[PDB]
Amino acid sequence: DGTGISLHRQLRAIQQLARNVQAVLGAFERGTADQMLHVLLEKAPPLAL
Amino acid sequence: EDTEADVPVTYGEMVLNGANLVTALVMGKAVRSLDDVGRHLLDMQEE
Numbered sequence: 642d643g644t645g646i647s648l649h650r651q652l653r654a655i656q657q658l659a660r661n662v663q664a665v666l667g668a669f670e671r672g673t674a675d676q677m678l679h680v681l682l683e684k685a686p687p688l689a690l
Numbered sequence: 691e692d693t694e695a696d697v698p699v700t701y702g703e704m705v706l707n708g709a710n711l712v713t714a715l716v717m718g719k720a721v722r723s724l725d726d727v728g729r730h731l732l733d734m735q736e737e
Contacts, residue, residue, distance in 0.1 A: 645705075645706055645707065645711040646711070646714065646715065649711075649715055
């Protein structure tokens with residue numbers, strides 16, 4: 642709208658979206674390590690045995 | 691009949707612009723001509 646408010650809400654829009662993307666792109670950074678463990682633990686005998 | 695004729699005018703208007711936009715989305719409020727009210731309140735203690 643010709644408004645100062647609608648622009649500002651659209652600012653919140655662009656802004657919150659950028660936060661979500663930064664997070665999910667960092668998930669595949671976190672998750673590649675978390676998944677690396679599981680495939681190590683899945684193949685690792687207990688030392689006692 | 692005084693007269694079939696008259697002299698009507700056009701619509702007023704207002705917006706939230708300088709300090710009305712800030713407070714509206716920060717403090718959550720707004721006032722007609724906050725610039726005016728702000729000028730007159732501050733000046734008023736400068737005599």
